[PDB]
Amino acid sequence: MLVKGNEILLKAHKEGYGVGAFNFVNFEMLNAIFEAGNEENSPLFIQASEGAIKYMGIDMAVGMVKIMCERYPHIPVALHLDHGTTFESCEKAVKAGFTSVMIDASHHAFEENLELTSKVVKMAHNAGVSVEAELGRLMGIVLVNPKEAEQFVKESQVDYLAPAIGTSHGAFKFKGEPKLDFERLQEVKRLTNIPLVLHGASAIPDNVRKSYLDAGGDLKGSKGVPFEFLQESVKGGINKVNTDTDLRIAFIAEVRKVANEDKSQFDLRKFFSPAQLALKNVVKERMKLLGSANKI
Amino acid sequence: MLVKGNEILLKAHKEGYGVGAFNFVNFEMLNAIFEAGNEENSPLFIQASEGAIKYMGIDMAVGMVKIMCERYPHIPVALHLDHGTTFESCEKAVKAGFTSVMIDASHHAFEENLELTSKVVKMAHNAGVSVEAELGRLMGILVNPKEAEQFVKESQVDYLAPAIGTSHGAFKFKGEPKLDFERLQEVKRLTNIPLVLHGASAIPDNVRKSYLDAGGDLKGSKGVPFEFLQESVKGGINKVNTDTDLRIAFIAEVRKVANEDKSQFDLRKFFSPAQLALKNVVKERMKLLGSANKI
Numbered sequence: 093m094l095v096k097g098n099e100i101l102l103k104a105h106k107e108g109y110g111v112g113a114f115n116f117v118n119f120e121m122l123n124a125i126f127e128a129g130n131e132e133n134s135p136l137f138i139q140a141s142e143g144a145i146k147y148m149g150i151d152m153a154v155g156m157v158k159i160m161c162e163r164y165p166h167i168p169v170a171l172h173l174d175h176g177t178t179f180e181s182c183e184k185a186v187k188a189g190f191t192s193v194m195i196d197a198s199h200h201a202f203e204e205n206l207e208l209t210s211k212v213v214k215m216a217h218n219a220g221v222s223v224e225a226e227l228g229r230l231m232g233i234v235l236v237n238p239k240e241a242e243q244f245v246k247e248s249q250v251d252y253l254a255p256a257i258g259t260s261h262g263a264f265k266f267k268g269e270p271k272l273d274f275e276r277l278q279e280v281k282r283l284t285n286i287p288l289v290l291h292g293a294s295a296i297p298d299n300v301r302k303s304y305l306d307a308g309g310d311l312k313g314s315k316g317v318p319f320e321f322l323q324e325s326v327k328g329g330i331n332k333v334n335t336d337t338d339l340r341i342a343f344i345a346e347v348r349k350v351a352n353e354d355k356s357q358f359d360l361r362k363f364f365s366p367a368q369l370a371l372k373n374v375v376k377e378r379m380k381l382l383g384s385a386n387k388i
Numbered sequence: 389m390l391v392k393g394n395e396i397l398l399k400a401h402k403e404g405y406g407v408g409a410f411n412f413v414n415f416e417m418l419n420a421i422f423e424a425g426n427e428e429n430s431p432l433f434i435q436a437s438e439g440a441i442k443y444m445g446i447d448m449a450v451g452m453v454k455i456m457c458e459r460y461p462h463i464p465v466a467l468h469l470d471h472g473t474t475f476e477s478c479e480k481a482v483k484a485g486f487t488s489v490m491i492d493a494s495h496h497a498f499e500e501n502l503e504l505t506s507k508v509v510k511m512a513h514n515a516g517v518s519v520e521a522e523l524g525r526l527m528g529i530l531v532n533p534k535e536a537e538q539f540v541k542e543s544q545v546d547y548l549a550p551a552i553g554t555s556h557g558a559f560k561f562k563g564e565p566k567l568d569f570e571r572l573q574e575v576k577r578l579t580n581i582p583l584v585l586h587g588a589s590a591i592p593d594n595v596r597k598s599y600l601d602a603g604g605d606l607k608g609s610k611g612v613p614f615e616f617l618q619e620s621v622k623g624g625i626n627k628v629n630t631d632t633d634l635r636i637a638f639i640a641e642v643r644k645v646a647n648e649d650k651s652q653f654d655l656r657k658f659f660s661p662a663q664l665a666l667k668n669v670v671k672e673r674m675k676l677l678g679s680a681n682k683i
């Protein structure tokens with residue numbers, strides 16, 4: 093039941109909840125994610141970065157997802173290109189069977205951003221594919237400006253938007269007190285009236301961290317978005333919550349553990365079965381937090 | 389593309405070389421094996437145990453292989469059920485798209501084995517799929533040649549796994565490795581079909597060295613020496629099952645990266661090195677057995 097990106101997000105937009113966008117790089121990640129979705133009766137946004145695609149091959153990434161779809165034909169799934177860097181990248185994704193693409197030109201000046209986003213929107217929409225873009229850039233305090241988002245959105249005709257409001261990617265998001273400009277968020281939601289996307293939205297739960305640190309990992313100074321901020325973000329109108337770091341930490345936590353507690357262990361399944369479980373649990377909890385659960 | 393197990397194996401039988409049959413449990417292993425096949429221009433035998441199929445799902449096991457085949461459409465690949473334990477297990481494999489199946493009933497008595505193996509053979513061959521069976525039990529330090537002749541003749545099986553002193557695991561021999569190549573040649577002679585060596589990992593010194601340098605523990609591990617692997621192929625072994633060497637080579641690199649960088653949690657950083665090490669174990673083995681440049 094692989095479907096357009098904004099079939100899922102239009103629904104999320106009007107009822108006002110969030111849909112986790114979960115990255116994967118292989119079968120283990122993908123399987124855990126679908127099982128979560130199945131267990132929480134939640135829509136799924138599956139996403140792969142350009143790096144992830146390079147690693148597995150686009151034929152395999154789209155191939156694996158379509159096999160998971162047949163297995164759980166009742167879950168609405170969008171397959172989403174995360175941080176597309178160029179038109180040709182978005183275009184390859186579109187030809188391979190992705191149903192959503194993000195074109196990230198938020199490092200460009202407004203006009204170049206708009207110009208490339210609009211080029212992407214047109215071939216995307218022509219093929220039945222939704223598109224994300226970004227305004228402002230991902231560091232905290234830069235921050236998006238509502239009025240140009242209003243304009244940016246109208247001119248490009250883009251399905252969803254990722255306004256920077258103070259998140260950044262990775263395990264170390266805030267050096268100071270968690271700060272996110274919700275007022276900014278609201279103005280943008282208000283002016284644009286489309287699904288909004290929150291990047292760098294991992295939370296870094298205390299159990300996930302503890303699990304990593306117990307296993308020998310090093311996460312000094314790490315700090316994600318608090319569940320509270322994740323919740324408030326959805327009240328603000330965020331409908332897509334990009335989540336990646338949390339999955340990887342939970343996954344590697346168990347790999348590190350198994351490696352530690354048994355030096356004669358080299359059965360791969362022994363390493364990745366607990367890793368899958370831990371990831372799946374991060375995803376199930378996040379689906380409930382954001383309001384995705386039971387939305388099927 | 390996917391082809392019948394004994395299309396690959398019959399060629400190996402007459403031209404007198406061994407084809408590695410490599411086990412896989414996920415994408416990383418599958419990819420490594422195919423690149424190795426590509427880089428050495430070798431025909432591929434891909435296998436999945438009942439346990440690996442349950443782990444990934446038989447839909448996904450066949451799925452990724454079909455994707456990997458489109459990727460490398462010039463490489464002959466057989467997809468084989470390893471240690472199928474029941475008629476029902478073999479039959480699901482056949483319906484899912486395998487091109488080969490092993491029905492392992494070697495733990496039964498001759499007549500119970502022949503009876504089940506033939507049952508599998510009949511439905512396999514009816515779906516154009518080839519069949520492997522086993523005779524003797526695997527255990528350090530054995531098949532009976534003249535029943536093998538009857539077994540094969542009665543069953544109409546396409547290849548056979550005669551036991552000659554190999555066993556699964558990183559610990560095949562208490563002391564010095566020993567295998568009965570006389571049995572083998574006699575079996576080959578009496579049967580005149582592709583033969584299969586199970587428990588054939590070599591546990592190369594570099595792979596062991598890598599795993600112990602990463603803090604692994606292979607106390608008392610020994611596998612079949614390259615020399616014996618070679619002799620086996622002279623004897624008439626055409627298919628050499630290889631799993632343990634892969635996992636050790638792969639897991640060593642995982643262990644290393646975990647030890648090397650405690651803040652590292654990018655999966656690809658763990659699995660790219662591990663794929664590379666697996667691929668290299670596969671490429672050397674392909675050369676050793678003589679599958680190399682047979683495409």
Ligand SMILES: [Ca+2]
Binds near residue numbers: 196198226229230
């Ligand atoms: Ca950006």
Ligand SMILES: [Ca+2]
Binds near residue numbers: 495522
């Ligand atoms: Ca057996």
Ligand code: NA
Binds near residue numbers: 139173174194224334
């Ligand atoms: Na995205």
Ligand code: NA
Binds near residue numbers: 469470471490520629
């Ligand atoms: Na086998």
Ligand SMILES: [Zn+2]
Binds near residue numbers: 292
């Ligand atoms: Zn992002």
Ligand SMILES: [Zn+2]
Binds near residue numbers: 471556586587629
């Ligand atoms: Zn075996």
